[model samples]
Target: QQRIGVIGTGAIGGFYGLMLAHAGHDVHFLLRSEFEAVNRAGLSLNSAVHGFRRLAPVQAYHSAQDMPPCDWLLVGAKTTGNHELAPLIRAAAAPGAKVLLLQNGLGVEERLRPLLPESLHLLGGLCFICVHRGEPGVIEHQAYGGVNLGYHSGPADERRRREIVEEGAALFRESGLESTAMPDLEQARWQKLVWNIPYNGLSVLLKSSTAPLMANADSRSLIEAIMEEVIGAAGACGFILPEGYADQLLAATERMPDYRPSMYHDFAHGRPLELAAIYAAPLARAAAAGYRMPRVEALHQALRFLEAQP
Candidate 1:
């Protein structure tokens, strides 16, 4: 059994740890002080997909310095913790250990690349799962638990990347979590971003859920407009979004009927939003490519103000 170190025991990290542990992997978790309850009792992972009650004998550490080196390091910490945790990861991860990042937004690997060596593999993982912290030691997985893992380039290290992704996908699947490896992983990342920016930004701005926003005529129109800008921006970057992408997304929301976007949940709980990764990063990329994304730019500005409001 390969040893795995999980940094940041939030919803996504905790959920992954639970599944991997259930699969009999040697899993260790690095969590904050609030997660002390898990050490006393055990980690509780309640989900629509699968449920685990008081999964125990799992190693929980409050500091990275106490963790033993492992074959893989899965960094699923909050985006804000990236800079602070980068050095710790460098120190604790075994040499040549692959680091898989399950984070939202863009440019996470880029920010950490300089700190790590070329020999250490860095994999980009985009998670489409929705989970929330029900309470200390409890994670509520709402819906969807698929993951797309691959290298950044399609033609770069194809065989090695595919093999690694397959390993990850198999691990998740064997543990009863849905997952897949995409050859064009960037496309999957961008496609998820398409729904993320519009829905997340709109949710923060309007403070509403996906069902009501997608159902209302005016709100749906705003969503469409934001989607158009995002689609255009993605095209400018050379990834052509699917035709009728906005309509397809809206239809999917109608199917779910009661889905609340992660962004809306963040707003409801007063957590910092992924404004830069979800909105600003793409908008800036579009501008650099000599393309205009007026709607997205405006929304980004609005979110900045909304995030900073006293």
Candidate 2:
């Protein structure tokens, strides 16, 4: 069993930490708001698939400086929190630890790589799950939970890089998660954005969930158009998304349990939306490549306006 440390314990961070802890590894968590409750009452997860679960005498801390370096460190913090957490993350990671991004959006590692030391391995992952933090020390799992990890590295460290990515992939699999290691991290980010841009944007602007958004024909068409634009952007960037991939995403969403994306939750509850990494970065990239995403820009404007509303 590998020694693992988690940097965030929100919906994505907490759920993954809970599962890893449950799978019998030594898991330590760096918490912010729920440190007292979890330290006293321990960590609890309510999984529809696994049923009510609990981890007793939980290992948690308020600061990463207090956390012991581990073989792997999973960063589940929202991208917005990166600026403040970068040093903390660098501090908590072991000399040869693999840093996994359990967060969202594009150009995340690119932004963070400069701030972190070169020896530490970094990987970005796309989490496909429906979950939310219902309360302090409580995570309510809604639907599917799978992780796709991308191998992010520079040209020189091929040998050590392979080891970290392999170990990182194995750790998730050992924790009973459906995990896959990806070679093209950027391409995967774009693929996820195809769905995220439309669903997440409309979920806030239209005030609806995935099912409701899919129920309306007009909204569905918009989703498809936005997805196409993302696909086109990906192609221009030299990564051709598979044929009929957009249709496959539509069918997949139609089958998922009615769910509200985290972005919608953040907007509804007055939390800041993760617009820069998810929308702005990708938009800038597409624009740089001479493609215009009018529909996505329109959605971005709507979300920006709604987010600014007091």
Candidate 3:
């Protein structure tokens, strides 16, 4: 069995690790809490979609240095800890191992590229699941969803990449989750970013759910405006938006009415947010591409202020 190392056993990481363990894989969870809880109580995942109580027998470690190197390293830590945890990840990954980044944002590869180079396989993943930590050894998955994964640059080895994605999809399916692998993952990542920058930010700023924002004409218009600016930025960076992109996004919002974006939840809980990677990075990209994104710029400034205020 292949050994998988999960760096952060938060919602996303925990969910993935739980699924992998359920699939009979040798999974180690690098966690911070005391090991007794996980060893005795096991991992308890409470979800609206599916609930499970099982002992994953995770080899828990408080630090990266204490854990054994693995074939795959899943970095699911928050965006704020990306830099601080990079060294730890470097130490935990065996040479030529694959690193799948399950966090949001852009430029993560650039930040870690210097340390790993071609020896490290960097894959970008977008997780649509909504999960949170209820307490130690307990996770609440508010929504039932899966992840979309693809190469950060391009297909490294088409056959091997397909195998990994297929394995992931199969594992997730067996564990009661849904997933798909794509060839052009950059577009998928950008599409998710468009939703993240506008809806996620606006939801956090307004302290509301998607229904209220999409129902009200004023809020809906604001969302459209923000999305348009993001579309413009993506275009400037050479990413073409699919036809009816706005319609598709609005439809998704309508479908997931009660869903509160992760950013909104983070703000509500007073946790640090991924504002920079979601909003600021795209704005910077637009500027570099000689495109003006005044709306995004304004939102970025507003969010910065809100994040700093006491």
Candidate 4:
């Protein structure tokens, strides 16, 4: 069992940490807002898809310094919280520990690298899941639980990096998560963006969930257009998506339970939207590569306008 340090125990972080703990990993959670409650009653997760419902007492700490060093540091915070996460990650990580991003968007590892110690093993992941924090210390898993992990930059040798990622994948599988180790992390990020851009953007713009968006022909067409634009941008940036990938993702979303992505939650809750990493960075990258994403830019503008509204 790996001694795991969880830096952000929000929806993504909390669910993954609870799964690891349930799988017998010694998971230590460094909480920000819910420390006392989680410390008093541990953590709880409810998943209808997986039929997992239990409140497991966990090793919880309010400060990173108070948490014991761990072999694997899982960052589950929102991308907007990266700045605050640097110091916490530093304190919770043991020597030779692997720091994995269970966060979102593109260029996450690059954005976070300078903030962390050069010695830490850096990795990135894409969580294709629908979940949200229902309350403090409680996570409601809606649908999908697969994660794709890949090496970012690290001091580890080529073989060691792959080994570390492969082992992390195995641990995720043991925890009942569908996991894969991706050789090309950048491409994987784009792959996830293809889905994230449309669903998340429209969710906020329409103030609706996935089901209605898929049911309405107009919004569904809009989703496709935005997805195609992202796909084209990714190709221009040298990450060619699979043919029919947009259709495949649409079908997947159609099967999923009515869900609101984290981006929509951030907007609804008045939390800062993760636009910089999710929209702006990718837009800049594609533009630099000579591909323009008009739809994405339009969506970004609309979201920015709505986000600014009182």
Candidate No. with top lDDT: 4
User: Mind sharing the TM-score for model 1?
Assistant: 0.92
> Which scores greater on lDDT, model 2 or model 4?
4
TM-score of each: 0.92, 0.96, 0.89, 0.98
The 10 consecutive residues of candidate 2 with the worst lDDT sum are 153-162
The segments of candidate 2 whose C-alpha lies over 4 angstroms from its true place after superposition are: 154-156
Of 1 and 4, the candidate ranking higher by TM-score: 4
Indicate whether candidate 3 or candidate 4 has the larger lDDT.
Answer: 4
lDDT for each residue of candidate 1 in 1-310, tens digit (9 for 90 to 100): 7788888888888888888888888999997745578887788877776755457756989888999997778888877677887777776688778788887776667767777766677777788776778878888887777787766422226578778778877877887777888776556667778788888788778878778887799998888888888788788888877889888877877765366667777777788887867777787788888889787788889988987887
Ranking by lDDT: 4, 2, 1, 3
Q: Name the lDDT value of residue 53 in candidate 2.
A: 84
Better of 2 and 3 by lDDT: 2
| Candidate 4 clash pair list | none
Worst 10 residues of 3 by lDDT: 149-158
Give per-residue lDDT, candidate 1, residue 255.
69
Q: lDDT per prediction? A: 0.78, 0.85, 0.76, 0.89
Q: Assess the local accuracy of residue 230 in candidate 1 as a C-alpha lDDT between 0 and 100.
A: 77
The alpha-carbon lDDT assigned to residue 149 of candidate 1 equals 79
